[PDB]
Swiss-Prot record, chains A, B, C, D, E, F, G, H, I, J:
Result for mutant: residue 33 to M: In FTD1; ultrastructural and biochemical characteristics indistinguishable from Alzheimer disease; accelerates aggregation of tau into filaments
Cross-link type Glycyl lysine isopeptide (Lys-Gly) (interchain with G-Cter in ubiquitin), residue numbers: 7, 13, 17, 27, 39, 43, 49, 65, 71
Disease field: In Alzheimer disease, the neuronal cytoskeleton in the brain is progressively disrupted and replaced by tangles of paired helical filaments (PHF) and straight filaments, mainly composed of hyperphosphorylated forms of TAU (PHF-TAU or AD P-TAU). O-GlcNAcylation is greatly reduced in Alzheimer disease brain cerebral cortex leading to an increase in TAU/MAPT phosphorylations.
Effect recorded for residue 16 to F: In PIDB; markedly reduced ability of tau to promote microtubule assembly
Residues bearing PTM N6,N6-dimethyllysine: 7
Subunit structure of this chain's protein: Interacts with MARK1, MARK2, MARK3 and MARK4. Interacts with PSMC2 through SQSTM1. Interacts with SQSTM1 when polyubiquitinated. Interacts with FKBP4. Binds to CSNK1D. Interacts with SGK1. Interacts with PIN1. Interacts with LRRK2. Interacts with LRP1, leading to endocytosis; this interaction is reduced in the presence of LRPAP1/RAP.
Modifications after synthesis and translation: Phosphorylation at serine and threonine residues in S-P or T-P motifs by proline-directed protein kinases (PDPK1, CDK1, CDK5, GSK3, MAPK) (only 2-3 sites per protein in interphase, seven-fold increase in mitosis, and in the form associated with paired helical filaments (PHF-tau)), and at serine residues in K-X-G-S motifs by MAP/microtubule affinity-regulating kinase (MARK1, MARK2, MARK3 or MARK4), causing detachment from microtubules, and their disassembly. Phosphorylation decreases with age.
Lineage: Eukaryota, Metazoa, Chordata, Craniata, Vertebrata
N6-acetyllysine sites (modified residues): 7, 13, 17, 27, 39, 43, 65
Omega-N-methylarginine PTM positions: 45
Tissue expression from the record: Expressed in neurons. Isoform PNS-tau is expressed in the peripheral nervous system while the others are expressed in the central nervous system.
Name this protein carries in UniProt: Microtubule-associated protein tau
Domain of life: Eukaryota
Organism: Homo sapiens (Human)
């Protein structure tokens, strides 16, 4: 006799009031990357960037991340 | 006889009032990266950046992160 | 007979009033990175940046992080 | 017979009134990093930056971190 | 017969009134770092920066950190 | 009665023995030039470079400059 | 009665024996130049570089400059 | 009656024996120059560099400068 | 009756024996120059560098400067 | 009756025996120069460096300077 009463009430007013974004000027200059290898070995679970020269402008009008994880385990 | 009454009440007014973003000027100059290896070996769970020259401008109108983790375990 | 009455009441007025962001000028100059290795070996759980030359401008209109972890365990 | 009455009431007016951010000027000059290794071995749980030359400007309109951890354990 | 009546009432007016941020000028000059190793071995739980030349300007309109940890254990 | 006997004897063994030029590697990195004016006025004899970002590699197998000026004047 | 006997004998063994030039590696990093003016006025004889960011590698196998000036004047 | 017997004998063994130039490595780092003016006025004979950020590698296999000036004047 | 017998005999064994130049490593770090003016006025004969940030490596296999000036004047 | 017998005999064995130049390592660090003026006025004969931040490595395999000046004047 195991009885679980699971009642989460989530009330979130996750909200942004954001006016004008204005003037945004991005001038990334030029660079040089020189990288040398011979053998690469890797097995299972890999996120890798090798010699990545990049410009990333991620401007969202609202950045809202809500993460809820619920784990219930009986062995 | 195990009885669990799980009643979280979450009331969050996560909210931002943000006016004009104004003038943002980003001029990243140019650099040089020289890196040398021969053999790389790695096995399981890897996030790696090697020789990464980059410019990242992450401007959100609102940055709101809400993380809730609920774990209930009976062995 | 184990009985758990779990009643958290979370009332958070996490809120920012932020006016104009004004003038932001970022000029990162150019540098030089020289790094040399031969063999790298690593096994399980790795976040690594090697020779990373980068410019990161993270300006959110509001920076709000709410983290709640609830763990209930009966062995 | 173990009975737990868990009633946290959290009322937080975590709030910032912040006017104009004004003029912010960042000019990072250029430097030189030279680092040499031969073999690196490490096993489990690693966050590492090696030879990282970088500029980070993290200006949030509001910096609010609320962390609550609740652990209840019966063996 | 163990009975726990857990009633924290947290009322926090964590609040900042902050006017104009004014003129902030940061000019980090250029330096030189030379570091040499041959073999690095480390096992479990490591946060390490090796040869990290960097400029970090973290200006939040409000810096508010609220940390509450509640641990209840019956063996 | 003005009599000029002008007898220059120029014997120059201007000579270079130069072997192999070897390996020459030029990597000019990227820079940024910002220059502002409104009105420029200049009159006669002008060699001017304004805002000139350039790479010049002038490698001659032999650099020999012989300049002879002979001026004879009777008023 | 003015009589000029002008007899220069120039014997110059201007000569270089230069072997192999070897390995020459030039990595100029990236810089930033910001210069502001409004009105420039200049009249006659001007060699000027304004805001010139440049890399110049002038490697001659032989650098030989011979300059002879002969001026004879009767008023 | 003015008589000039002008007999210079110039015997110069201006000579260099120079072996291998070896390994030359030049890494100029990145800098920042900020200069401001409003009005510039200058008249006649001007060699000027304003805000010039530059790298100059002048390696000649032989550097030989011979300068001879001969002036003869009767008023 | 003015008679000039001008007989210079110049015998110069200006000579260098120079072996291998070896390993030359130049890493100039990054600096910052800020200079402000409003009006500049100058007239005749000017060599001027203003706000010049530069790296100059002048390595000649032989540095030989021979300067001879001969002036003969009758008024 | 003025008679000039001008007979200089110059025998110079200006000579250098110089072996290997060896290892030369130059790492100039980064500095900061801030200089302010308003009006500059200067007239005739000027060599001037203002706010000049620079690195100069002048290594000649032989440094030989021979300067001879001969002036003969009859008024
Ligand atoms: O804000 C910058 O000024 C803009 C240009 C400018 C000029 O040339 C001469 C002058 O008398 C005034 C002037 O005001 C301009 C301006 C731009 C705006 O976005 C703004 O909101 C403002 O009030 C006024 C700016 C932006 C730039 O991107 C830039 O590179 C820079 O050097 C300057
Ligand atoms: O704020 C900077 O001034 C802008 C340009 C400028 C000028 O050229 C001459 C002058 O008399 C005034 C002047 O005001 C300009 C300006 C820009 C603005 O965004 C702003 O809000 C303001 O009030 C007024 C600025 C921005 C820049 O990006 C920059 O590189 C710089 O050097 C300066
Ligand atoms: O605040 C800086 O002044 C701006 C330029 C400028 C000028 O050129 C000459 C002058 O008489 C006044 C003057 O005021 C300008 C200005 C910019 C502003 O953003 C601002 O709010 C202001 O009141 C007034 C500034 C910004 C810069 O980015 C910069 O590099 C610098 O050197 C200066
Ligand atoms: O605050 C700086 O002055 C700005 C430029 C400037 C000038 O050139 C000549 C002068 O008579 C006055 C003058 O006031 C300018 C100014 C800028 C402002 O942001 C501001 O609020 C102000 O009241 C007035 C400043 C900023 C800079 O970034 C900088 O590098 C510097 O040297 C100075
Ligand atoms: O506060 C600095 O003065 C600014 C420039 C300046 C000048 O050039 C000549 C002068 O007669 C006055 C003068 O006032 C300027 C100024 C800037 C301000 O931000 C400010 O609030 C103010 O009242 C007045 C300053 C900032 C700088 O960044 C700096 O490097 C410096 O040397 C000085
Ligand atoms: O001289 C450089 O070495 C070259 C590359 C290299 C290497 O990768 C690993 C190694 O065990 C030896 C090695 O010898 C190479 C080499 C190049 C030559 O031109 C050379 O005359 C020589 O004897 C031998 C060099 C040049 C480069 O351009 C460079 O960027 C660098 O880092 C190094
Ligand atoms: O001289 C450079 O080495 C070349 C490449 C190389 C390599 O990859 C691995 C290695 O074991 C040896 C190696 O010798 C190469 C080489 C190139 C030559 O021109 C040369 O005369 C020589 O002897 C030998 C060089 C040139 C490059 O352009 C360069 O960018 C660099 O990093 C290096
Ligand atoms: O002379 C540099 O070494 C080269 C590379 C290298 C290496 O990687 C590992 C190693 O065990 C030895 C090694 O000898 C290389 C080498 C290059 C030559 O040009 C050379 O004449 C020589 O004898 C031998 C050099 C050049 C570079 O350009 C450089 O950036 C650097 O860090 C080093
Ligand atoms: O002379 C430098 O060593 C080179 C590289 C190197 C190394 O990596 C590990 C090692 O056991 C030995 C070693 O000898 C290399 C080397 C390069 C030569 O040019 C050379 O004549 C020599 O005898 C031998 C050098 C050059 C560089 O440019 C540099 O930046 C540096 O840190 C060092
Ligand atoms: O002379 C430097 O040593 C080189 C590198 C090196 C090393 O890494 C580990 C080691 O056991 C020995 C070692 O000998 C290298 C070396 C370089 C030569 O040019 C050389 O003639 C020599 O005999 C031997 C040097 C040069 C550098 O440029 C430098 O920055 C530095 O820190 C050192």
């Amino acid at each position: 006799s195991v009885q679980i009463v699971y009642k989460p009430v989530d009330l979130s007013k996750v909200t942004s009031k954001c006016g004008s974004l204005g003037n945004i000027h991005h001038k990334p200059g030029g660079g040089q990357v020189e990288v040398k290898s011979e053998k690469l070995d890797f097995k299972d679970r890999v996120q890798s960037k090798i010699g990545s020269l990049d410009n990333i402008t991620h401007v969202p009008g609202g950045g809202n991340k809500k993460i809820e994880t619920h784990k219930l385990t009986f062995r």
